[PDB]
Structure 1
């Protein structure tokens, strides 16, 4: 599908509210495999299961390994911009 930019608002006491799979070491993108009900990703409205996360706050994730992506994603705070695509 089209590449989308999506805004997420997170409070400091919460996580993003997603599960991710994949990573470069597996030859597949960082993919959203779960959107947890009521948590920030669900609330933002624009992120969905099956979306590939291409970037977050301008950081490219298309070539990141799984645990690299976890570190980068978990570091983001507040108003967080995602670049995503549903294939």
Structure 2
């Protein structure tokens, strides 16, 4: 499928609602493994299990290890743009 840019609105008191696997050390993209019901990722309607997260708010995560990608993702606030692809 094509690259999509998807907006998510996250309140400060909540998580994104996404489980993440993969990363550079695994030789695979940062991947969405679960979308948790009622949380921002579910609510936005545009993120799905199996999507690769290529970038978030213009931070390229195509070649980043799991931990560091998760840290960057966790630091994002408010209206957050995900660049994703389901290949």
Quote the Cα distance in structure 2 between the aligned partners of 1:73 and 1:86: 19
Aligned length: 87
Shift of 1:19: 0.2
TM-score, normalised via structure 2 length? 0.99
Gaps of 5+ in 2: none
Quote the Cα distance in structure 2 between the aligned partners of 1:39 and 1:66: 22
Alignment map for 1:1-87 (pairs within 5 Å): 1-87=1-87
SS at match of 1:68: helix
Shift of 1:76: 0.1
SS at match of 2:68: helix
Gaps of 5+ in 1: none
Runs of 4+ in 1 over 3 A off after TM superposition: none
